[PDB]
Design a protein around this motif. Structure first.
Motif, mmCIF file in Angstrom:
data_model
loop_
_atom_site.group_PDB
_atom_site.id
_atom_site.type_symbol
_atom_site.label_atom_id
_atom_site.label_comp_id
_atom_site.label_asym_id
_atom_site.label_seq_id
_atom_site.Cartn_x
_atom_site.Cartn_y
_atom_site.Cartn_z
ATOM 1 N N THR A 111 -47.117 17.567 7.976
ATOM 2 C CA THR A 111 -46.406 18.524 7.116
ATOM 3 C C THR A 111 -45.620 19.476 7.900
ATOM 4 N N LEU A 112 -46.185 20.197 8.920
ATOM 5 C CA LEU A 112 -45.460 21.111 9.798
ATOM 6 C C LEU A 112 -44.215 20.491 10.376
ATOM 7 N N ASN A 113 -44.358 19.341 11.025
ATOM 8 C CA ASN A 113 -43.300 18.597 11.614
ATOM 9 C C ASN A 113 -42.291 18.186 10.606
ATOM 10 N N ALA A 114 -42.631 17.755 9.345
ATOM 11 C CA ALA A 114 -41.694 17.479 8.325
ATOM 12 C C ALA A 114 -40.868 18.752 8.015
ATOM 13 N N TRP A 115 -41.499 19.946 7.969
ATOM 14 C CA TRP A 115 -40.706 21.159 7.817
ATOM 15 C C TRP A 115 -39.739 21.341 8.917
#
Lengths: 74, 147, 147, 74, 147, 74
Positions: free
Chosen positions: E19-23
């Motif tokens: 999720t972090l990386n997708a952001w």
């Protein structure tokens, strides 16, 4: 870039221009009624003379598939 | 989406990022190709209106088509309101309100309201009504975008 | 697909995107090669008719083959209806209806109906009947597409 | 592109043409009966003279593997 | 974020690295494009202020915009304090304190405090108040960064 | 391509040919007994003269590792 600065080239297909229009229209946040006004007005106005001529012959009441197929050879 | 939990009830759970990204990637790669419609249909399994606007709003590019679809969604919604008139007298305390075209489009309804309608008994398939409008509007696009 | 839950019951769960994409990628890479059939068979484990139409409908390319398969699926379905006649008199309230070729092909049946037949006692293996038709039609294709 | 505009080249293998046909047929949404009519009719009609000749010799009742193996050397 | 556990209570769980990386990746790829706002909105589902500062603080690049946003967040926060005055007399032992603009921005509040406000009955939607400020400030940016 | 059309080149290693054979044999669906008949028969028959000569010297009863090591220098 402002919506008034969106215009059709002399060799640019209308299609590529209409895409640019609803992308920039996509970044306008105005009331729907104003955006309807922009649709019927500004699109044709900044369209090139050859297609502009074509679009004048469709009359009013016209929808996007018919405009888009109308200016295809231009 | 609204999914069934282990306990045996229908609860809402969020859609996954690599699901989101798979939706994005389909559109990137196959644009207006027909395989987009079964693909959509699978990835829309158990989906809300709210999730369906999310999917449509997260598109980039093909803005002429995106506008044609919008306008089809509103036409189909206008038609929902026409065909199904509002019902007689005030809304009962014991009951929840009937949807309009804009509740189906997700616009005038809240999530908890979208979960009320679908989870309640009888359930009403507001996803499947929007889904047909999307598929219908997908046919319009496909037919136009054929060269 | 219809899978067994932790509680010890058979419930439906959706198929995964990287499963979907793995189906896509196999077809992209190995086209009509025989390894496609065991591959199919593994990825079709516990699958519904509905999921099997999804997999067939999501193909791009090789449309001559896709049409030959369709026409094989309908022939095999026509043959199901021939061999198994409809049963005597009206359908019992206490019972659920026998399938036709088109219910096996997923066409005339709904998901809940597909789950009724498979989960019920005795269960009927409508997946495995469609699976043979797919494998049979896969042989037809493989044999033709040999050069 | 329209389904009537789908035709077989003078050097194009039938096979590559039949693929094009059921792709375009795949974008037609008409009743099955009409699409059956299109299958038996339009496919052969826009097929090239050399294969067209071949297909006339198969007679009616013919299926796709037999058509596809019939026009292979052409 | 604050999520519902299996037991049927609202508990905090950490946000995921992909999720972090997708952001991160969204921001890398689509910069100031409008699709960033629905995208944000989905990935901010059930998120805390604390998680929202984490997301803003983890940006690299576009520092003129990041400063404009900060300054919008403080303006919107200053406005929260203006519109909602502090309440009459001392804070009750039986109750928990009303938030300020800086508690909404996550700055003066602790996580357990952010969980108190959201999980308590009535709950207060301090995420959704910050979310509008973020979306409002996103409009400011989008409008400016149009060329 | 048909199994009868599988043949060994004049410069092609047997090995590359045997791979082609069990790939095409892999697309044949016949009874095992027939496929055994194809194995002992067609493989050697369409093998090149230099290796063919070699394989005749192995006699019958031979297995694939011994055939494959037998025609290695050829």
């Amino acid at each position: 870039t402002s919506i008034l600065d969106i215009r059709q080239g002399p060799k640019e297909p209308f299609r590529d221009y209409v895409d640019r229009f609803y992308k920039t229209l996509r970044a306008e946040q105005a009331s729907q009624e104003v955006k309807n006004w922009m649709t019927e007005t500004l699109l044709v106005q900044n369209a090139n003379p050859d297609c502009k001529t074509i679009l004048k012959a469709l009359g009013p009441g016209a929808t996007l598939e018919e405009m888009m197929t109308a200016c295809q050879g231009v | 989406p609204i999914v069934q939990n282990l306990q045996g009830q229908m609860v809402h759970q969020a859609i996954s990022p690599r699901t989101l990204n798979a939706w994005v990637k389909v559109v990137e790669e196959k644009a207006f190709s027909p395989e987009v419609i079964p693909m959509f249909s699978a990835l829309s399994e158990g989906a809300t209106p709210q999730d369906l606007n999310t999917m449509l709003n997260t598109v980039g590019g093909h803005q002429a088509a995106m506008q044609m679809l919008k306008e089809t969604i509103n036409e189909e919604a206008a038609e929902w309101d026409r065909l199904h008139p509002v019902h007689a007298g005030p809304i009962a305390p014991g009951q929840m309100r009937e949807p309009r075209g804009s509740d189906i489009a997700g616009t005038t309804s809240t999530l908890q309201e979208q979960i009320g309608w679908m989870t309640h008994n009888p359930p009403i398939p507001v996803g499947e009504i929007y889904k047909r409008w999307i598929i219908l509007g997908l046919n319009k696009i496909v037919r136009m975008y054929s060269p």
